[PDB]
Structure formats: C-alpha cells, structure tokens
C-alpha cells in the first residue's frame, strides 16, 4: 500500500483505482490525474469512499476527511477538510501525457507515438497498460468447439454466437481443452496442433490470455561512454572474415549499449557471432522475441563458435520446434541462445538483442530486468517489420515509434550501419536503398537480370478481411510455364488467404511478408494482392523484395511502388 509515484517517484499511500495497472500517484500528481480525467477513484490502505453507511460516493473530488475517516458533501462533519485542495489529494508524505496513456484504448497510432516519446517511467506504465489492454481484449472473442474431424490436418469448427471470431491466421494461437496450443488456416479449415493429439469432437479452444507482470527495469539503461574497452578482452588474432567489424566491436566495448542498423543481408548474424570471436572470454546471451530469430543466431554460432559452450534455452511449455544441435537449458554455458519470454535471471559481459524492429517496449524492459550485463547490443533495422499491434486500427505506426531502440536509430542515427547488401541482385538493392535507406545501402552483387515487375490489379476477393487476387495468381501460373527455373520459387504475399490459394494453384511453398522476415530464397514471386495501407507499407515492401538472392517477380497493384521497382517490366 506504500510505493513510489510513477511520474515523480515521490513516496505515497495513493494508487489510482480507475487505471487498469493501479499506479502509485503522489498527492501533487494524483490531483492532476483525477481533476483532468474520468478517473476519480483513489486507493489507499482503505479506498477514498464515503464511510457513511449505504453511501455510494467514490469520486475523490466530492469527498472530505472527518477526523481520520472519509465522507461526501452530504455526510461530512462540520470540521472536515476536502481531499482535493491546492493541487493535491490528501495522503501520506504530502502528467498531461500520463492522463492520455491511462485513459486511451490503444486503437490510435497517436497512443503508440506517446508511449514512445514520454519519459522512461511513463514508457513502462504505457507498456504495462497496453499489454494488459491487449490481454483483456482476447476475452472479447468467441470460443470455437470442434463439430467434425475430417483428417489429421483438417476439421470443421462451430463458433460462439454474440462474440466476434478472431482472425484465423498463424498470429492467433489458441489453447486446446490443456491439450497443447493450436492454430488454423482456411467449410474446410486446416488445424496445426503443437502436440499431436487425436482431435476430439466437442473439445473447445480459447485464446492464451496471459497475466501481464509489472515492469521495473527501463527500456534502455542510461547510456555510459568509456575511454577504453571496459570489462571485455579483445584478440589481435581475429580471423579476416570479421576484420570489417573490428572498429564497431571496439565501439561496442567503449559504451554501455550500442545500436546496429543492418539492412537485409548486410551481415547482422555475422556481426553478432563475430563479437564472440573478438571478445573470446566474454559470456554472451543471444536473445530475440521469436524462436526463428534465436534459431538463426544458433545456426551462425554452430559454424563459428565451439558447440560445447553453446546452450539453447527452451521453455518447459515447449510451443514450436526449434534449434536441436546445442545442449538444452544449460543457463551456465558461455553462449546462451534464448527468446525474451524464456530468459533466465542471469548476468553477461555482452547481451545481443537481435531483430530489434520486432521488440515492444515491454520486451526491452523484460530483457533489462532478467539480464545484468556490462554491454547491451541492439541489432536490427527500423526499415523492417514491427511487432503486430492487435489493438491499433487507426493511423500507421512509423518506425521511430516501434520501440525506444528504433526511436534512437530514426532520430540520432544508429551507432553502427552495415552499408553493403551481399544477398540481393543490384536491382533490389538500388530499389530499397532509395525507398527506405536514403541511398546509403550499396549492392555487392551485380544486377541478376532476373528481377521482373508486372502492373496487374486483377480482382480482389476477401476471406472475411484477408485478401485474395486469383487473376494475380493466374498471371504467375502463365509466367511459370514460360520460366521453369522459377519452379523452385517461394510465393510471398501480404495475405495468408492469397497464400492458401497460391499454394493449391501453383504448389510453390508459401510465405507472408511478415513470416518471410530474416529468411532468404533464390527466387521470390510476390503478388501485392491489394492496394491497401497494409500491402503498400514501405517496410513490408522492403522486406518482401529483399528476400531474393537471384530473382524476383513482383505482380503489383500500386502504381507508386511499381514505378519505383528498378526491374525489367513484363507484358500481359
Ligand atoms: Zn508524483
Ligand atoms: Zn487513473
Ligand atoms: Zn456520503
């Protein structure tokens, strides 16, 4: 009942009862909250409510102190002091932005902008509030009960009436009933169970509503600059492979935390693992939000670091299949590879946080709370995709608002920038360099002369709200017959439903732009599907076309992005 004020640290007996997180507010700040918002309930050891039997006055602005007790205007004794006077609420030890965070529904971009331009303690309040709001929104959706089981990978579902149906993509993981986590794709629906359980008719699913723990650590620890490499011991014997990154590796040792913006295929994994070889005695924890991001860092480590000093941490509630070639759950190994949500409470000489565009401020805080480290390295690209904000429906979230790290990279610049793309044919490098990298990304590879664009709006049908463009898939089919080298191509679109249709008609392996991030393929076929803010997002467009090592075919709906593609145009 006694804590610190989230705005000015001042100790208090006062929490806001109307805030979902019930933050401690000091007398001076608690007033400015209750007098400017619909939030009027104030909590202490006992709540600020009229003590008179059967009186329902809970508004702190309508209440007074009668001796040591609280009463309304109708019940207060003659000698009574109002709880609201001289810019204070009466409590022991006697904000515009705090009010907006406390009362917003998180459906507006401007909400996320504020949660990322506010003070550091308000970034934690914002991140707790948001995640709590995100979790209580999961309860809004209807239950799905299994009507009939067709096979081992298909069934028919019955949905609760009066409650909306959640989007049936990979982003929405149900808990089966505790028969393990499950997902669905498009009345023939495809069921993907984490544990292979003989799907029972009548068994119901509910979305994994997890409890939001409070945040203590900042998103970013305060910056410290050093005169010399601190707490790390370099080599002189450093293989030429990693010689490019020696000056950056020294920068990492001469600051508390550093930011690396690595555009696609510019050597992020190579840099992350090359850091271990430069500080060979240093204990490094490798963390990212996703299992795929952590498994990509494991693959690079397997090639360059000794396998007996590497441990892949896997949560006891094992959700999806992940990296197998390390010792599992040895927290004490010199090299630890673990997702943010599974991180143990430990210390490190260096923490490397990868795929930083996908981190929320909640993720940034949890890392600082579980890992005490000499150096923090933040690797990713603010020109790539952020974490989905399930509540945000109005306005577009710009890269400078993704999280504190991206904000720094978009304002003061990143500490280090990998400027040469080794993956993509020059046609793709030149396109994205101009689009999102202010012409600072350079091509290693020559033009492939295998990068094609076709402007073809087709016809847009919708599986609920997920978009399909059968004519765009039809154009791809015609192209494949005349270009049999593309038989090996990965099909990519901004929509699962387009992918589902392209899977049946083309038989190509299929990937959403969002799930393609961090991966690379020889050939890519991209159908934009629609002209929407989703399918025209320059970050998503950037990720889409930079997956390709050799060739890409882009069937485009948007004139702007079509004209910018520096590709050979095709006819039909
Ligand atoms: Zn305060
Ligand atoms: Zn409040
Ligand atoms: Zn009363």
From Swiss-Prot:
Catalytic activity: ATP + H2O = ADP + phosphate + H(+)
CV ZBD domain location: 1-105
Binding site for a ribonucleoside 5'-triphosphate: 262-269
Domain named (+)RNA virus helicase ATP-binding: residues: 237-418
Ranges occupied by LRR repeats: 208-228
Result after altering residue 372 to C: In strain: Omicron/BA.2, Omicron/BA.2.12.1, Omicron/BA.2.75, Omicron/BA.4, Omicron/BA.5, Omicron/BQ.1.1, Omicron/XBB.1.5, Omicron/EG.5.1
Outcome (variant: residue 36 to P): In strain: Omicron/BQ.1.1, Omicron/XBB.1.5, Omicron/EG.5.1
Ligand binding (Zn(2+) 11): 5, 8, 26, 29
Compartments, as annotated in UniProt: Host endoplasmic reticulum-Golgi intermediate compartment
Occurrences of domain (+)RNA virus helicase C-terminal (ranges): 419-572
Top-rank taxon: Viruses
Listed result of changing residue 240 to Y: In strain: Epsilon/B.1.427/B.1.429
Assembly behavior: Interacts with nsp8 to form the replication-transcription complex (RTC): nsp12, nsp7, two subunits of nsp8, and up to two subunits of nsp13. Interacts with host TBK1; this interaction inhibits TBK1 phosphorylation and decreases by 75% IRF3 phosphorylation, which leads to reduced IFN-beta production.
Function, in words: Plays a role in viral RNA synthesis. Multi-functional protein with a zinc-binding domain in N-terminus displaying RNA and DNA duplex-unwinding activities with 5' to 3' polarity. Activity of helicase is dependent on magnesium. Binds to host TBK1 and inhibits TBK1 phosphorylation; the interaction with TBK1 decreases IRF3 phosphorylation, which leads to reduced IFN-beta production.
Protein name: Helicase nsp13
Protein's organism: Severe acute respiratory syndrome coronavirus 2 (2019-nCoV)
Gene from which the chain derives: rep
């Amino acid at each position: 009942a006694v804590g610190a004020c989230v705005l000015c640290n001042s100790q208090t007996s006062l929490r806001c009862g109307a805030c979902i997180r019930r933050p401690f507010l000091c007398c001076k700040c608690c007033y400015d909250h209750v007098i400017s918002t619909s939030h009027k309930l104030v909590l202490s050891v006992n709540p600020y409510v009229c003590n008179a039997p059967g009186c329902d006055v809970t508004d702190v602005t309508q209440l007074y102190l009668g001796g040591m007790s609280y009463y309304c205007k109708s019940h207060k004794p003659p000698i009574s002091f109002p709880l609201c006077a001289n810019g204070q609420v009466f409590g022991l030890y006697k904000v515009t932005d705090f009010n907006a965070i406390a009362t917003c529904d998180w459906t507006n971009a401007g909400d996320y902008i504020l949660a990322n331009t506010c003070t550091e303690r308000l970034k934690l309040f914002a991140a707790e509030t948001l995640k709590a709001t995100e979790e209580t929104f999961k309860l809004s959706y209807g239950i799905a009960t299994v009507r009939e089981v067709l096979s081992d990978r298909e069934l028919h579902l019955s949905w609760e009436v009066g409650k909306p149906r959640p989007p049936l993509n990979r982003n929405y993981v149900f808990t089966g009933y505790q028969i393990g986590e499950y997902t669905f794709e498009k009345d023939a629906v495809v069921y993907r169970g984490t544990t292979t359980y003989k799907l029972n008719v009548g068994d119901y699913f509910v979305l994994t509503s997890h409890t939001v723990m409070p945040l203590s650590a900042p998103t970013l620890v305060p910056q410290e600059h050093y005169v010399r490499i601190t707490g790390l011991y370099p080599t002189l014997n450093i293989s030429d492979e990693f010689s490019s990154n020696v000056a950056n590796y020294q920068k990492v040792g001469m600051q508390k935390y550093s930011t690396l913006q690595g555009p696609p295929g510019t050597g992020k994994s190579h840099f992350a693992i090359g850091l271990a070889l430069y500080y060979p005695s240093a204990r490094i924890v490798y963390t990212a939000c996703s299992h795929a991001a952590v498994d990509a860092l494991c693959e690079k480590a397997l090639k360059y670091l000794p396998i007996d000093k590497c441990s892949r941490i896997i949560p006891a509630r094992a959700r999806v299949e992940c990296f197998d070639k390390f010792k599992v759950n040895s927290t004490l190994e010199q090299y630890v590879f673990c997702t943010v949500n599974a991180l143990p409470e430990t210390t490190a000489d260096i923490v490397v946080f990868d795929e930083i565009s996908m981190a929320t401020n909640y993720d940034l805080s949890v890392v600082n709370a579980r890992l005490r480290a000499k150096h923090y390295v933040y690797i990713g690209d603010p020109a790539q995709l952020p974490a989905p904000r399930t509540l945000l429906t109005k306005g577009t979230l710009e890269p400078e608002y993704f999280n504190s790290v991206c904000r720094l990279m978009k304002t003061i610049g990143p500490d280090m920038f990998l400027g040469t793309c080794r993956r993509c044919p020059a046609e793709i490098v030149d396109t994205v360099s101009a689009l999102v990298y202010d012409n600072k990304l350079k091509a290693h590879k020559d033009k492939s002369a295998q990068c094609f664009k076709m402007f073809y709006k087709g016809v847009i049908t919708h599986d609920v709200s997920s978009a399909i463009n059968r004519p765009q898939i039809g154009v791809v089919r015609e192209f494949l017959t005349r270009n049999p080298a593309w038989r090996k191509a990965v099909f990519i679109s901004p929509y699962n439903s387009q992918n589902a249709v392209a899977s049946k008609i083309l038989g190509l392996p299929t990937q959403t732009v969002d799930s393609s991030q961090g991966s690379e393929y020889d050939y890519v076929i991209f159908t934009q599907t629609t002209e929407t803010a989703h399918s025209c997002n320059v970050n998503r467009f950037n990720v889409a076309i930079t997956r390709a090592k050799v060739g890409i075919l882009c069937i485009m709906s948007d004139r702007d992005l079509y004209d910018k593609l520096q590709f050979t145009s095709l006819e039909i």
